Design a protein around this ligand. Structure first.
Ligand SMILES: *[C@@H]1O[C@H](CO)[C@@H](O[C@@H]2O[C@H](CO)[C@@H](O[C@@H]3O[C@H](CO[C@H]4O[C@H](CO)[C@@H](O)[C@H](O)[C@@H]4O)[C@@H](O)[C@H](O[C@H]4O[C@H](CO)[C@@H](O)[C@H](O)[C@@H]4O)[C@@H]3O)[C@H](O)[C@H]2NC(C)=O)[C@H](O)[C@H]1NC(C)=O
Ligand SMILES: *[C@@H]1O[C@H](CO)[C@@H](O[C@@H]2O[C@H](CO)[C@@H](O[C@@H]3O[C@H](CO[C@H]4O[C@H](CO)[C@@H](O)[C@H](O)[C@@H]4O)[C@@H](O)[C@H](O[C@H]4O[C@H](CO)[C@@H](O)[C@H](O)[C@@H]4O)[C@@H]3O)[C@H](O)[C@H]2NC(C)=O)[C@H](O)[C@H]1NC(C)=O
Ligand SMILES: *[C@@H]1O[C@H](CO)[C@@H](O[C@@H]2O[C@H](CO)[C@@H](O[C@@H]3O[C@H](CO[C@H]4O[C@H](CO)[C@@H](O)[C@H](O)[C@@H]4O)[C@@H](O)[C@H](O[C@H]4O[C@H](CO)[C@@H](O)[C@H](O)[C@@H]4O)[C@@H]3O)[C@H](O)[C@H]2NC(C)=O)[C@H](O)[C@H]1NC(C)=O
Ligand SMILES: *[C@@H]1O[C@H](CO)[C@@H](O[C@@H]2O[C@H](CO)[C@@H](O[C@@H]3O[C@H](CO)[C@@H](O)[C@H](O)[C@@H]3O)[C@H](O)[C@H]2NC(C)=O)[C@H](O)[C@H]1NC(C)=O
Ligand SMILES: *[C@@H]1O[C@H](CO)[C@@H](O[C@@H]2O[C@H](CO)[C@@H](O[C@@H]3O[C@H](CO)[C@@H](O)[C@H](O)[C@@H]3O)[C@H](O)[C@H]2NC(C)=O)[C@H](O)[C@H]1NC(C)=O
Ligand SMILES: *[C@@H]1O[C@H](CO)[C@@H](O[C@@H]2O[C@H](CO)[C@@H](O[C@@H]3O[C@H](CO)[C@@H](O)[C@H](O)[C@@H]3O)[C@H](O)[C@H]2NC(C)=O)[C@H](O)[C@H]1NC(C)=O
Ligand SMILES: *[C@@H]1O[C@H](CO)[C@@H](O[C@@H]2O[C@H](CO)[C@@H](O)[C@H](O)[C@H]2NC(C)=O)[C@H](O)[C@H]1NC(C)=O
Ligand SMILES: *[C@@H]1O[C@H](CO)[C@@H](O[C@@H]2O[C@H](CO)[C@@H](O)[C@H](O)[C@H]2NC(C)=O)[C@H](O)[C@H]1NC(C)=O
Ligand SMILES: *[C@@H]1O[C@H](CO)[C@@H](O[C@@H]2O[C@H](CO)[C@@H](O)[C@H](O)[C@H]2NC(C)=O)[C@H](O)[C@H]1NC(C)=O
Ligand SMILES: *[C@@H]1O[C@H](CO)[C@@H](O[C@@H]2O[C@H](CO)[C@@H](O)[C@H](O)[C@H]2NC(C)=O)[C@H](O)[C@H]1NC(C)=O
Ligand SMILES: *[C@@H]1O[C@H](CO)[C@@H](O[C@@H]2O[C@H](CO)[C@@H](O)[C@H](O)[C@H]2NC(C)=O)[C@H](O)[C@H]1NC(C)=O
Ligand SMILES: *[C@@H]1O[C@H](CO)[C@@H](O[C@@H]2O[C@H](CO)[C@@H](O)[C@H](O)[C@H]2NC(C)=O)[C@H](O)[C@H]1NC(C)=O
Ligand SMILES: *[C@@H]1O[C@H](CO)[C@@H](O)[C@H](O)[C@H]1NC(C)=O
Ligand SMILES: *[C@@H]1O[C@H](CO)[C@@H](O)[C@H](O)[C@H]1NC(C)=O
Ligand SMILES: *[C@@H]1O[C@H](CO)[C@@H](O)[C@H](O)[C@H]1NC(C)=O
Lengths: 488, 488, 488
């Protein structure tokens, strides 16, 4: 043997995975990873977020103090979960802007209630109904005070309560809507009631409407629920000639991370940052396809059910078994110890060795990409709706749909673009190792065109190792090689 | 002739088109295609979407049953088109939340009306006005029932209508606003009217306001229009001591693809998926600059009036007419049969041949890109407004403007980035064919530096063809070539 | 000296700056520039936008004509600035949809007021209060007319005012809310008041609510403020049996660039296109981290406090002082005159020269990128809120947060992607100059593997200059070089 072959090549695998680039619709790589979380455990983890299971109670029924919700008094949450099974079992009521009251109480994160010393002169307090049983007898909302006539008169109620504290007070109050003119006069002497609740800049002016509503728990009557916020330095005044459902005091308002979610998923003893109505999901992936409704440190919702990011190079796996070949022809499935390396034929037979510098350079770039590819949101907007509403709901749905489409586009582009760069940097390290070998060899070898060098001199395993190391002296073999090349 | 020249080159065209990349503000390519649809036919195609021309009717006037809109009874649509010419010709009315009622009826896609057997005891039904002529005599809205006194009394009306069906019922009802106290007492005996319309969870409480409004079709009086949805299992109760404009029954509510658009474009017998107020547009392009208002499978609206995607490579078109040159100097306008190929000078004169593998590889990548570059939206938000409104309209306009700017950015970046990759992959196939030729030739040729090889041996057309094929044996010419190179 | 060394290399700097690419977390470049404006001067520049300092006045108090705001009569602005110090000093009032009235007046950009000849028959005009002093005596809002009884009667007021102009008229009017039934009867004879204000399609129906509000400037009474727009051809009718706070005329409505901002930043005599509440900012950078609230030609708000765009190439700065080396080993800190160039050792010693073509090509591409990297928004949505409101505020905040996150993502990706292309194009120009030199030299030099050529012939400074120029004849040295290469 007067010559040697030194082939440059890269690893390949028997299986392999198809991914998208900018340049190729489908290209096989050695390895890929999923960027879309498509699976939930089905359970909401009660750590690290404080989960409050509403059970049979909406947040509003906990707020008002519906007797079967009295267990939620002074409750606090990071996430209130309202169940499908929830029912109201007190006086039948409406909240004109239900969604807003639900939202601002949810965001406050507390039903911390402070009873205040309201003095109601010339009226009988603590009115009850058989539609709102507490214990054996008739009762009412724990946080509201049903005022009616004393003897045969109902005076103009005119009370004030100053806010001398350094936080916002939330006052929940109501207006009674009697079923008949008979019912109006019996409870509140005047034929037409009135509830004015004001601060220095704000006022609410509500007139009760007499009439039969649908029978609920015995009653065709209704309470309409209102709220007033009073800031530090400001004051509350309540003025009524009838139909006032009075506050007992205020809810202490807070700022921070608290929200509310509709889910029937059971609460479990586990740890997960990200909550969806389907259950907790892991947040290791940048994107998720489980639910557009999320709470906590979550992947971004996208329309795609899968996105495959390349974590490896292009995968390139008839009687001629002796010959060796390089990267121009194909990859090497035998190459265990590295991504790139050498195969040679010489005096001492066939050998193979990985190159760790080229291998590590490729791995370090891909790991750096993965590091950057792998935000916490708390109270957001509602994304599902049980009633048709028109304009506001149309805008809420259009905002979320706009968002999903823009992030879905961002996710599609990012994966295609990074996959393009991963193919390119992995091809680049192969070419760099071939060029680096070419430059060492000088005039002692020529390019066989298959990603291998024909070395035109005796090059034993020690000689080959010197090429694989930095240290090969072209000069010591130059005479021998030039003679082999340019004569025979 | 002891030598040959083999030049590697690519095609060019006399004309050419400027495009944007990341790296170059303007770069000439052989071919480009438009990604922004900037043109409409001016006509809405009535296929495949069911178009309902409102003609002289708004959707609300079709809903209420304004006599000149009676042709729209039980009508269904995918897209209702409201015309500028539309007029109301019945009782003068307002709809407090007009936009929401218009939106939820539009989205429902039907005026399927089911008359119900409401019994109105102690009142005269079917009230009419000269402001709402049907035939020769006075009339009213087809879907509403104007109730007034019978003899000299108007009782407390207290009727119920249960929803035992498995769909949502939409009830349209109204409150009459008389011009004078005289007019109030004459129609409805009580000096002050009342309309309470409720379900188990919802109630609406409306008090009529007596006063002169502007004279419209004889009248300073007005009807205010309200709606109530009642779900399966729930019930409607209507309670009034006066001024009730009664429903005759319900509209059957549906979910799906239906919407409404303001346009004066004529309806034509043609096929187009995408509808704009300017007329139908083709949807072959990813983007459009015609209108931010669209219906159906449409290109995304962007601010740009043109975006040019490269579908070809860089376009590179003094006494020395004999000599040939390669891709380093320029492209070849003569190259008819391919994108890349060969030019040679030898014993048998000057020849030229295209390389189909390199040509097809470039074409297949570009066609794959185009395949991915070439969403259906139905009911959205309003994007134009005839009245100033403040907060809600500001948010609707800000949402749409936010969207347009983000998609305009996405379109600008995508075209620049894909154009960068198209230039790079087209340059790459040229370099790959030059390197592939270099490797075949081994020590029989050297690089002339103009993208041509000087072959240092007699290489006839058969020899050249063997280089253009896979099959060239450097060994059979090596002796001859080394002698030609390293002596003379 | 029978040989020469010609090294190809690029410049480097002692310092250098770390930037992000797609491929590298951190990579050192010779130069970089900031894309995020993080600094304000602290002052709003009064050029080129017309700034109106509200001083002690909100826009609404300027509109209504609160005496201490009478200096703002007929005022116009591009940007109204409301100060924290602003106070109201007239009749205590609420505006049911304050934010909308504030928004549509701000967007109109004018308080141009036209007094109209309203005739109020059977009522005493120009009612005043000690809570609204103008001069020594009691007064009222300049733009409103407080109507009360004349003698002992208050008739049904029924006035009309047609719009025969070709612009929209904005009418500001109000309803008085007395503290007691005593106060209602004394001012307006009827026990229950009424204000109906209508156009042909629109009507507002307001009933006053009697009751004590919190004491403000002597009074527990309140005025509620309403607005009506009347288009050309349409007409206004006002109908009241009491409590009407009458308009004196209309505000002329305009379309265009006008908005409003909350700021305590002082107004200065300087020029800046972009205004934030923190003060004016320069708009040379694409992005800014100062405030999501902006007015004018502004950078886009992003979460990042810094983004570094590469404006230069990769920065690559033991007894062996004689030897020279090329770009494979490192960059040259000595290279003053260019980005790329040549170093050589020959008969006449060591030399160095820059290549201007390669240098200029790299600079022109980078300057073109910077040109494209370096939008005006006027009236937008509110982005900060002094009160909790629920649903609408949740949507306004969610829209802005959605926007910030999408632009922050766009800015992160764009910088990483352009930096990737800047590294690649700067590496490319180096490789192109090395390949261009290689092709000139033909068989007279071989690649030393350090980005230098060993020229195997005597190559003096004139010979080297001919290589640096286009004009080097390999043939004249070929014999000498082949002899030097393939013998000794
Ligand atoms: C305005 O118009 C509305 C609607 O028409 C009226 O509201 C209805 O009012 C009646 C009561 O006046 C409700 O009818 C039923 O009342 C029963 C009371 O029980 C006693 O009376 C019945 C007489 O038939 C006896 O059979 C019974 O033994 C008792 O002696 C309830 O028992 C009924 O309950 C309902 O729910 C249960 C659930 O288990 C069912 O089993 C029953 O079948 C039934 O569905 C029922 O409530 C009726 O519900 C009201 N309807 C609505 C829609 O609200 C107003 O009264 C009227 N107002 C005025 C002033 O006239
Ligand atoms: C509260 O205040 C409002 C506004 O001031 C009043 O509303 C106006 O009411 C009057 C009717 O009382 C309207 O005036 C006109 O009525 C005409 C009726 O026709 C007969 O009477 C006139 C007497 O001048 C004769 O000329 C005519 O031959 C008939 O005998 C209409 O014909 C008028 O029509 C209008 O439109 C036509 C379109 O073709 C034009 O040709 C006319 O020029 C005219 O513009 C007109 O309607 C008046 O329109 C009402 N104005 C508004 C703005 O609504 C309320 O009456 C008042 N209420 C109370 C209780 O006092
Ligand atoms: C419904 O309920 C509300 C709230 O309870 C009542 O509103 C309060 O009304 C009273 C007046 O009736 C307000 O009290 C004070 O009135 C003073 C008037 O000055 C004279 O009277 C006092 C008698 O104590 C003398 O001391 C004084 O010398 C005068 O002769 C004001 O001077 C008070 O001013 C306030 O602000 C100044 C700021 O400098 C402070 O210095 C004072 O300490 C004080 O804070 C004060 O206004 C009281 O403010 C009202 N409260 C609210 C919350 O509105 C309604 O009167 C009641 N309605 C009915 C019909 O009963
Ligand atoms: C195919 O590609 C995937 C994704 O790059 C490779 O999986 C990743 O492998 C690395 C190294 O084994 C894992 O890193 C380790 O993670 C654990 C847990 O955080 C940590 O304790 C260790 O210190 C280390 O950082 C990484 O988690 C893992 N990623 C995933 C998503 O599974 C995989 O190795 C590749 N497969 C083959 C056969 O090469
Ligand atoms: C310049 O580039 C454009 C865009 O790539 C080329 O136009 C495209 O040409 C192809 C092949 O001729 C067309 O494909 C055909 O489309 C029809 C209709 O769908 C189909 O029936 C055929 O089977 C085939 O797929 C393609 O539609 C057409 N695109 C456009 C937008 O016109 C064009 O060929 C290039 N010009 C030159 C001179 O090379
Ligand atoms: C490092 O990179 C920065 C950014 O590319 C270079 O700063 C830029 O330098 C150019 C040329 O000196 C400046 O252009 C000039 O701008 C002025 C003002 O508009 C104009 O009158 C001139 O005709 C010219 O166009 C450019 O403004 C400047 N940009 C910034 C942001 O400072 C800088 O030269 C580089 N540093 C080194 C040491 O190479
Ligand atoms: C809910 O929390 C509030 C405090 O936020 C409790 O109010 C205190 O009640 C005790 C009763 O002995 C009083 O001594 C305190 O003065 C009250 N605090 C304040 C700030 O007024 C309230 O008792 C709690 N209720 C429940 C059911 O836990
Ligand atoms: C998470 O829950 C949502 C809502 O329950 C699921 O969305 C529904 O999925 C069903 C079953 O595939 C479809 O029939 C409906 O069209 C979906 N409705 C809506 C409103 O989205 C979602 O598929 C669940 N995801 C996972 C992974 O469990
Ligand atoms: C509109 O459609 C409804 C059905 O959705 C029609 O209602 C039916 O009318 C016929 C009249 O003979 C009755 O026999 C049916 O009982 C009605 N159906 C229901 C479900 O109640 C209605 O007639 C249609 N009207 C028009 C003008 O086409
Ligand atoms: C589609 O229709 C819209 C609305 O009519 C056009 O937009 C207007 O275009 C005119 C004429 O160029 C301008 O004067 C207006 O400023 C535009 N108004 C609005 C509200 O956009 C649009 O140009 C039409 N496009 C096509 C291609 O016909
Ligand atoms: C505010 O501007 C309006 C014009 O927009 C002024 O109204 C004019 O007042 C003069 C007074 O002599 C009359 O002659 C004109 O007829 C009025 N114009 C119109 C269109 O009616 C108004 O005077 C200005 N007020 C202030 C304080 O500057
Ligand atoms: C511009 O002004 C805003 C609002 O005053 C500043 O934002 C606040 O910054 C302070 C101090 O860093 C923080 O404590 C607050 O959390 C921020 N509040 C809000 C609502 O953003 C902003 O930092 C200012 N920027 C500059 C450059 O002056
Ligand atoms: C082979 O790759 C495919 C890619 O879709 C994957 O689903 C499968 O699990 C892999 N199988 C093995 C045995 O590695
Ligand atoms: C030449 O190219 C330009 C590009 O703007 C195009 O507008 C024109 O139609 C072309 N002309 C011919 C004859 O191909
Ligand atoms: C050196 O570069 C750093 C980059 O962070 C910069 O902050 C510093 O001002 C520079 N110093 C000099 C002397 O150029």
């Amino acid at each position: 043997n007067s010559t040697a072959t030194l082939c440059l090549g890269h690893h390949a695998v028997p299986n392999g995975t198809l991914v998208k680039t900018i340049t190729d619709d489908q290209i096989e790589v050695t390895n890929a990873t999923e960027l879309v979380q498509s699976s939930s455990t089905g359970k909401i983890c009660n750590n690290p977020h404080r989960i409050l299971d509403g059970i049979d109670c909406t947040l509003i029924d906990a707020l008002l103090g519906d007797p079967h919700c009295d267990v939620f008094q002074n409750e606090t949450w990071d996430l209130f979960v309202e169940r499908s099974k929830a029912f109201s079992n007190c006086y039948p009521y409406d909240v004109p802007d239900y969604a807003s009251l639900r939202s601002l109480v949810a965001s406050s994160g507390t039903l911390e209630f402070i009873t205040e010393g309201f003095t109601w002169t010339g009226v009988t307090q603590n009115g009850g109904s058989n539609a709102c049983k507490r214990g054996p007898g008739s009762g009412f909302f724990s946080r509201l005070n049903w005022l009616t006539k004393s003897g045969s008169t109902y005076p103009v109620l005119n009370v004030t309560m100053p806010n001398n504290d350094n936080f916002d007070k939330l006052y929940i109050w109501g207006v009674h809507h009697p079923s008949t003119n008979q019912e109006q006069t019996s409870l509140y002497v005047q034929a037409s009631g009135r509830v004015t609740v004001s601060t220095r800049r704000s006022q609410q002016t509500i007139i009760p409407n007499i009439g039969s509503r649908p029978w609920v728990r015995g009653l065709s009557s209704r309470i309409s629920i209102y709220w007033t916020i009073v800031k530090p330095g400001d004051v509350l005044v309540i003025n009524s000639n009838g139909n006032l459902i009075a506050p007992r005091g205020y809810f202490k308002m807070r700022t921070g991370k608290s929200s509310i979610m509709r889910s029937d998923a059971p609460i479990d003893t586990c740890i997960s940052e990200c909550i969806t109505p389907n259950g907790s999901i892991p947040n290791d992936k940048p994107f998720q396809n489980v639910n557009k409704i999320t709470y906590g440190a979550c992947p971004k919702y996208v329309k795609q059910n899968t996105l495959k990011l390349a974590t490896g190079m292009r995968n390139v796996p008839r009687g001629l078994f002796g010959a060796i070949a390089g990267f121009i022809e194909n990859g090497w499935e035998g190459m265990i110890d590295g991504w790139y390396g050498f195969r040679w034929q010489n005096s001492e037979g066939t050998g193979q060795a990985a190159d760790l510098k080229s291998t590590q350079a490729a791995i370090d770039q891909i790991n750096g990409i993965l590091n950057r590819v792998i935000n916490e949101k708390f109270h957001q907007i509602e994304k599902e709706f049980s009633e048709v509403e028109g304009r506001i709901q149309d805008l809420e749905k259009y905002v979320e749909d706009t968002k999903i489409d823009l992030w879905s586009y961002n996710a599609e582009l990012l994966v295609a673009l990074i996959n393009q760069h991963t193919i390119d940097l992995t091809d680049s390290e192969m070419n760099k190792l071939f060029e680096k070998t070419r430059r060492q060899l000088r005039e002692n070898a020529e390019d066989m065109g298959n990603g291998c060098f024909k070395i035109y001199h005796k090059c034993d395993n020690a000689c080959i190792e010197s090429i694989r190391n930095g240290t090969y002296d072209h000069d010591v073999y130059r005479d021998e090689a030039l003679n082999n090349r340019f004569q025979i």
